[PDB]
Design a binder for these strands. Structure first.
Lengths: 267, 264
DNA sequence: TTGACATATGCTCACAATGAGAATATGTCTT
DNA sequence: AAGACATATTCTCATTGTGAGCATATGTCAA
């Protein structure tokens, strides 16, 4: 199977392309007529979303974890375009820390603390996985550890896809391991924007300084330092001035910027 | 569906890779119904083709062929059949300076870019970012992209171009392409957080770890700069024992910290 | 179309902290 | 005390970090 993880940003909200009423990502089998793995997925996206597709890059290859029963191999791909879209945080509400720490995390830590305290031998162990990914025994919030966080909830039976005898589920579930595929694309994108935010596909042909920060903060799910975001784009030599002006939120002018041609030469 | 493995070891200051079929292919095996996970399935093919104990595997890249799917995995072990990394990629080892085989490669890569005037100004940008035709700086992380440029230029045995030009030892199917992905993945991990407790022994020294990182990255590193990087990343600790270095002199023995072995 | 407070933008300090390049005293043989 | 060559250990002039001002510059409900 070829599962597509296409992402767009609208009204400061990272959305993902979905099908089957947001219960599954656009996926399609790998046929004999398909030449490359990318061209074959472009066919299934065209006849299920009819949406223009930007450049794609591979994400990860997972094997099915079917407790019911031929095996299934899924190869995911990440795509960035401009905008059936469902937000990133409808399936992962605990990943948006723009407005501080969310409230659903407390219900997760309590369900994670009891799962660690269930076995005394695994107690000293499982408290370490709950401190590196989440924050049970302290630590900090690393937004890069998105995939490792979902695998812990799947292992603790705290999601609908785990099929525990107590139906404990946080976030909207998806068919099979489609929420597992979405978690890999978010962590991969978050790992790219922390050091070299090349996001000309999610933005327009020209944007401003505050608009790009609001987009990066929506992807990483963390409110960034205002002045520190200026010197990172300057040191990376990412954008340049277009020569025009616009109007910002609050009725104030700001210079318009576009991604440098050299950055579009990297892509 | 194929499961190809890229197992790497370091012996006598030379990063080797596990090979089968007389050093012409990596240990591979088709995915079947009995294998539960992709990792447990590859551990079975390695256990019978090489019988070698395997470390912890991480996924590399999934490639397509002309109908066969291949999935690569990277592994670091201590060498307990082997061929060096640079037998297939002689142009990647720059420990002794720029290899003279690069001069024969850039000349062939230049006539390929200059063959089409319209593609001239464009193709000269691939050989400058990856290689060094138009100058630039040597980036050891671009190992895979460098091999993709030789395959597209027809300068390898796997390209099957009418002028039979080949640099390095070829492999079956795209196995050298899988090895190029493992080297680029490994070299990207050691540049900032060299977690190589599997390649090293139970206890090593400062120069011994520097030689291993320089052997993997293929570049001689600064001595004092290598000291502050391992100290900042908090990777190793002292074992309380002294040793006899290359040169007959006392130097403290070091081991990877337990907290490092608790990650990944 | 026009007023005091009203909401982001460049442009600018500030130390804390890091960083490519060299330089100082400790020690391990074979002579 | 003649030297040999690698260890753990200062000093320096740079570049990225986090946290705080400083001069623009308004459209927004009233008149």
């Amino acid at each position: 199977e070829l599962i597509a993880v296409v992402t767009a940003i609208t009204t400061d909200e990272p959305r993902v392309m979905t099908v089957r009423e947001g219960a599954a990502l656009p996926s399609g089998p790998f046929e004999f007529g398909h030449r490359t793995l990318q061209s074959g997925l472009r066919e299934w996206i065209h006849e299920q979303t009819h949406h223009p597709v930007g450049y794609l890059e591979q994400l990860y290859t997972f094997a099915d974890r079917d407790r019911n029963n031929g095996r299934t191999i899924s190869i995911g791909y990440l795509g960035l375009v401009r905008e059936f879209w469902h937000g990133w945080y409808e399936y992962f509400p605990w990943e948006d820390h723009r407005q501080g720490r969310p409230d659903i995390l407390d219900s997760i830590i309590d369900k994670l603390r009891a799962w660690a305290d269930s076995e005394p031998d695994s107690r000293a162990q499982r408290h370490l996985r709950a401190d590196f990914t989440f924050g049970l025994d302290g630590g900090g919030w690393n937004e890069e550890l998105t995939l490792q966080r979902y695998e812990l909830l799947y292992e603790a039976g705290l999601v609908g896809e785990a099929q525990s005898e107590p139906r404990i589920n946080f976030g909207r579930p998806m068919f099979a391991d489609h929420r597992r595929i979405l978690a890999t694309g978010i962590a991969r994108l978050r790992a790219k924007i922390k050091y070299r935010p090349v996001v000309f596909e999610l933005m327009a042909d020209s944007f401003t300084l505050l608009q790009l920060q609001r987009a990066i903060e929506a992807l990483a799910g963390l409110t960034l330092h205002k002045q520190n975001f200026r010197r990172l784009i300057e040191q990376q030599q990412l954008v340049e001035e277009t020569g025009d002006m616009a109007t910002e939120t609050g009725g104030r002018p700001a210079k318009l910027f576009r991604f440098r041609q050299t950055v579009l030469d990297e892509r």
